[PDB]
Design a protein that fits this description.
The complex is a heterodimer of chains A (21) and B (82).
Chain A (H helix, E strand, L loop, with lengths): L6 H7 L8
Chain B lengths: L2 H20 L3 H21 L3 H32 L1
The chains are: A mainly alpha (21), B mainly alpha (82).
Organism (chain B): Saccharomyces cerevisiae (strain ATCC 204508 / S288c) (Baker's yeast)
Family (chain B): Belongs to the AAA ATPase family.
Protein name (chain B): Vacuolar protein sorting-associated protein 4
Chain lengths: 21, 82
């Protein structure tokens, strides 16, 4: 259920797309 | 149902929103952004690392802001042309 994800790990596995600008 | 799974689905949905946004399909994009926000919110709820929570919150806010910008644009455009 719950996770304790390191942020640097999160950012390698999940790259957030940027909105149009 | 884990935070990683929720993030995967959220990012897919927001990517879809962004594609619709770029395509000028703004009403559909607005809906898609909020679909994405649902899953980012769920990811947030199941994440316990405070740094990662704040990362997700920051992205949530970026997509929220874009969605609301589209909404205001849609309404203002319609009001200008009414």
């Amino acid at each position: 259920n719950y996770s304790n994800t390191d942020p640097e790990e999160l950012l390698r596995k999940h790259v957030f797309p940027s909105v149009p600008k | 149902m884990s935070t990683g799974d929720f993030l995967t689905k959220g990012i897919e949905l927001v990517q879809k929103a962004i594609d619709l946004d770029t395509a000028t399909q703004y009403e559909e994009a607005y809906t898609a952004y909020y679909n994405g926000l649902d899953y980012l919110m769920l990811a947030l709820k199941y994440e316990k690392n405070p740094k990662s929570k704040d990362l997700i919150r920051a992205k949530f806010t970026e997509y929220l802001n874009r969605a609301e910008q589209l909404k205001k644009h849609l309404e203002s455009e319609e009001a200008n042309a009414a």
